[PDB]
Amino acid sequence: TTEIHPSCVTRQKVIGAGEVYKGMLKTKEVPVAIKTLYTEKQRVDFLGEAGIMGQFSHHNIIRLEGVISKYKPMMIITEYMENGALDKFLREKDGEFSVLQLVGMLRGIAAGMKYLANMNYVHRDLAARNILVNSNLVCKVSDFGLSRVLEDDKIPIRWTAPEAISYRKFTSASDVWSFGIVMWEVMTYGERPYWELSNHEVMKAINDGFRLPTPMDCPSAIYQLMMQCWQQERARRPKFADIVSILDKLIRAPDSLKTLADFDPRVSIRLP
Numbered sequence: 359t360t361e362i363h364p365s366c367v368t369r370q371k372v373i374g375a376g377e378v379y380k381g382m383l384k385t386k387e388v389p390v391a392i393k394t395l396y397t398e399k400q401r402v403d404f405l406g407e408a409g410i411m412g413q414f415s416h417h418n419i420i421r422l423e424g425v426i427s428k429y430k431p432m433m434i435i436t437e438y439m440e441n442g443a444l445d446k447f448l449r450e451k452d453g454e455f456s457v458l459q460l461v462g463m464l465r466g467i468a469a470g471m472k473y474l475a476n477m478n479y480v481h482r483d484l485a486a487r488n489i490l491v492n493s494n495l496v497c498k499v500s501d502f503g504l505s506r507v508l509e510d511d512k513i514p515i516r517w518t519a520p521e522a523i524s525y526r527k528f529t530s531a532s533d534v535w536s537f538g539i540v541m542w543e544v545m546t547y548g549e550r551p552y553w554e555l556s557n558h559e560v561m562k563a564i565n566d567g568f569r570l571p572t573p574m575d576c577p578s579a580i581y582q583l584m585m586q587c588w589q590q591e592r593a594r595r596p597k598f599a600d601i602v603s604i605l606d607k608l609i610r611a612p613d614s615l616k617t618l619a620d621f622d623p624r625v626s627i628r629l630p
């Protein structure tokens with residue numbers, strides 16, 4: 359990582375909460391996000407996250423500018439993502455994008471995840487809340503926090519693959535499951551997966567073969583792809599490489615997206 363002198367950084371506005379700030383970096387000044395920090399474990403985890411981010415260089419992975427580690431409080435300095443977290447963004451912008459735009463967002467996320475997976479990094483916590491959006495609608499994987507544990511052991515059950523829940527096997531294939539959930543988040547403009555089902559209701563439903571119902575006006579090819587991400591058997595799930603390839607083909611032949619999946623029976627029963 360680049361060590362950045364504090365005189366080069368001004369914090370302006372809290373954007374998350376240590377806390378995260380929007381600010382300016384002057385190594386001619388550029389907007390940045392600034393996260394501030396503690397025990398030895400906290401320090402190792404905080405600088406650990408920076409070290410992980412600094413090891414990556416990919417369009418769809420949040421870019422680290424540098425750290426303040428020689429002075430306290432310690433800080434992480436990243437690019438500033440103008441549109442914030444994807445979950446909140448989608449819920450505030452319901453209906454405002456084309457299908458092609460939404461699919462493009464998913465391709466970007468898939469490309470980032472392919473890169474992580476190929477770099478032997480298993481995310482464990484892939485969700486719309488952990489993706490950020492810039493002013494070109496580029497989606498970047500954006501949370502590399504290290505002290506993470508499964509809900510009801512931080513990481514929510516209903517985004518997690520069955521094998522990760524059942525016997526703690528987190529792999530890139532369990533991240534693909536999570537990506538399937540993100541697909542459904544994006545195509546629904548940030549609906550909560552499984553709505554008010556309890557954690558144990560979700561797990562029972564999944565184990566009995568149920569999956570999330572078709573989003574409204576969702577392209578058939580997109581629903582087919584998210585369903586394959588949710589195969590019980592990991593070896594039947596697509597790899598990120600496959601997902602990128604498929605999404606690219608759909609984007610380059612956009613008429614392919616005009617064919618819509620039909621209404622789920624669980625949706626029919628709730629309409630008057």
Ligand SMILES: COc1cc(-c2cnc3nc2NCCCNS(=O)(=O)c2cccc(c2)N3)ccc1F
Pocket residue numbers: 373374378391392393420434435436437438439440441442443446490500501
């Ligand atoms: C400095 O360290 C990091 C910062 C970010 C980050 C970059 N950029 C923005 N927010 C970030 N985090 C807070 C997200 C939650 N608030 S939000 O959705 O309300 C929001 C709103 C507007 C912009 C924005 C966030 N932009 C990501 C990873 C990091 F390690």
